[PDB]
């Protein structure tokens, strides 16, 4: 019930919708075009339709949905591929057979006829349960067990519990009554993208995001449930860091979110993920897709879907965190999302602000980024998850002055700063140590000292060495290495060794594909301790340089060792090398 | 007394667009009347009636227009402007943006309902600030000091430790003591702060043990953008009640005033108002006045409201509309330099652009020393000459610094090294710091000093 | 002597001239886009309001 | 008496001003002099606190009467004026000792006061000075932050949806500001005796 009255491009006016609500999604026309309500002036409505509105007919029916832009969560959310508006691309392609996306597809987000193995918890048929209680878990696939949380805003004494067995989402797995009225819940939960997910308490982040790369792990650490920023426009560093996060990061899940980038780039990345495979610490070999969800909205996709992809991804990440899993979101191109928002604002004729973006761009970006953090779960049993966002930025020409870049730098705690200059100089990590920073180091210092009380001092010494590296750089630039003192020469040599041996990774090489934090800490110790032990001896720089050739080779090889030997063997080898270097530095003095 | 009336509940909502909710057939509306909107789902949110024309009403809802149905939502007209239930018991508590008690405590039992945006003080009855303040930081007190009733903000770009400086000032705040009941009560507005910053503020304030005399008006970035505009209003109204109507001096603090500017810009762009510079509303000067222009001392009352805002230059540019208008209104600046932060100085206060327009009255003979003004002027003026010498050395060479310029360069170096730097918890007294300030001024010869007379500092004696 | 002259010229160009020009470019960009573009939309918006 | 605030006071015939304004400042009276009847304007960008020159000029001018009509200025300046002008003093040729507050009036409204009153402030100030001039004195004023009475214009033009001319200001801004400034000048007044009073408009324009 409801018919269109005026169709001016994307904007659509439909009469007979007195009961419509603002921002309620609606189905327009026989083709089931999907659009969101904007203005409810009079008894009429106003809808902007995402897909092309060409060919609409006056008095074509309009069908309400009684729900805002929402995502159907539950089993089967992992692995698949979804559009910006939560449209399963893979199943759409299989059903329609052809390649083109049909104008008005109506495939449900998750297949409601597929069977998943279900088994309840030890709860009783007449017990009491509340919102967020974990009443069952499902083996969606191997090694990615999926907990079934009773939806929030739903509570009451238990009435029926489905016994363990094979079931589908259409089955009524749960039914309960709060008052005399009883409600039955399936395995599918719908939640609006704009509304965040209910939380019990925002904890303080207390565990680093071990990305497997030494430069990010030690120099500029990032904590679970913490924002991150990447100036990714070239050098494939964004692809490299995304692959590292998918394969080696501590997160139990990853939710890539791609909006408004080049279509072939998304093709390349979405073909790269299935090829990516990660080995289990127990020796098992798995596929990253078994723990990966992908929301990719190319430029050809409607602008509104491009804007909504980010919120869809963050809501998916929050739902994953609802069962205490550590999940990491990855916004492919926030600049593209901002451009989509700008286009939408221009469609709405909103008053332009700085550089043309709407005045709420900073506010909306902050609202999105504020959802990341380590959070106590809702409902029992007690557990705690985390959501960390590693959303990248694409400043125009590298000038960190655009409002998107400025707002992101103002909100994001940790900025890693990939540099194209290092990429030109053949640097695999490509992380510019001169601009990167980790504002969460003060909070992470508790764990840093618990693991090793000397590690934080080593990090401070390394930061001082990096600061003096540029000083020695202009010193050599203006007068040369001749004017450098023995201590200055030792400091410069140690800085160069740190840059070319530990601060840089080798990625492609099997020995340096993954850098454990243990190996990173031992390498940092074997570098800094040797640097000091050589420093206080000032001894002729040439003499120590000649007599430390074996020590220099050991320091260089302190990163060539493969992780095959494991932590106990590599730690012992690094300790022996450090002791030998200390003996050589002290005895020869 | 005039008989009471129950507020009319309407259901004639006949239009929603942006953040503005239209109504029709309103029987006797009132401008700026607070209306709480109950949606069809039953959830309730507040709102103000912006424009009143004929029998219509253009309401601006607070929690957002989402979920409003043109045939199921109900609007109730309370018939009174927004009022904050201020009370003396409100001390030592935490409130939301609109004032909801969020410390797991019972709501405020109001001693009196007071309307926000209170009327101005008759400037005939207005007085002048005449007492210094012991914040606990050296460089602010020694030069460009703060008077008990003076407004002055902190200019500090994003990422700088200005939040830590504000927390240290609030925890170490106190009178000169040259009393506890009338001692500094701190109203701590927090417009658009991050969650981590919010937890930091709560923990730091609870740790110093001065919860008994500090009120937090926290408003996170998650809260609605319009609700951030009323947070400074509520904070300043509570400050007005505490100071003028109860006596104790209030040291009002508002963090991230740029967030308030952004909220104003968003609200104005929503209603499509005439834009000033950088798309900001054309009345931003008046709004920043209604926020700032309340610090001062009233003649008949012993209270005093001291204002210490904290702005943030967006592009680290002083010419941005928000800091420019503030400097027009705020009677002085205390400036924080990113360049000094690059030198690893904990309180990165740059003194070259930092001046207190009321310092000429804070100084005198009742407090401080008789050489305060001249020493401050010299350490303010010779810094510029040292900077010029540094620029000349950069553009010519080390040989350009003559027997005079090299003295200015050494003065600048020692001034940035010893004088400005201070401990994270150092309560450096004025005289002990003024001795080192005199030493810095004496690095230059005691006869080349042009502006200062020799006798002024000669009255004071070393050791 | 020649190196001193060349270094003085290079340092002056790096410090004075370029850092003089770039603020001028930023101010010119702000004056055009920050004012003229904003006014054009506001003028047209007021015109559309008059038509409505 | 009574007089409309926008209609200028009638005169006999305006005439050229040829007496310098002894401000007591070296720069104001040496390099860039002002005449008793001319119009001045001090930009004083943000942070300069240009009102110090205003107060010094009011304190030490040779003008017989000063009308400090600061519009949109901070209240603390008005508190300073009210506190210091009585306690501050000046001497006259008769030899006696008297205060400057005996001849200074403030029509000032602060920035936190309602916006629409600012134009009324400016116009009342100029009319009061015109009356004191018709008395025959060499009265003068200085309107602090006249640029605030352009925000007052545009914050009304926006409500009326008038067509924005430049930066939001209406089209008649220059016309109205000229109609205000063009009321200064030495003039033989109406009626005998032959009073030849003047009036000076030392405005202040705060630019963004």
Short mmCIF file of C-alpha atoms in Angstrom, two decimals, chain A residues 22 37 124 155 174 181 200 211 223 232 316 423 430 435 442 492 503 516 581:
data_model
loop_
_atom_site.label_atom_id
_atom_site.label_comp_id
_atom_site.label_asym_id
_atom_site.label_seq_id
_atom_site.Cartn_x
_atom_site.Cartn_y
_atom_site.Cartn_z
CA UNK A 22 11.84 8.82 9.35
CA UNK A 37 12.77 7.82 3.77
CA UNK A 124 16.66 -25.62 31.68
CA UNK A 155 14.25 -11.21 28.27
CA UNK A 174 13.85 -20.72 21.20
CA UNK A 181 2.68 -13.20 26.52
CA UNK A 200 27.79 -3.35 29.64
CA UNK A 211 50.32 -7.90 13.78
CA UNK A 223 46.27 -2.27 21.39
CA UNK A 232 47.51 4.05 2.14
CA UNK A 316 29.00 -6.95 11.98
CA UNK A 423 58.77 2.00 -0.93
CA UNK A 430 57.39 0.89 4.38
CA UNK A 435 56.08 10.24 11.53
CA UNK A 442 51.25 4.65 28.15
CA UNK A 492 75.11 6.26 13.68
CA UNK A 503 63.19 -1.95 11.87
CA UNK A 516 56.95 -13.20 16.96
CA UNK A 581 78.67 -9.56 21.99
#
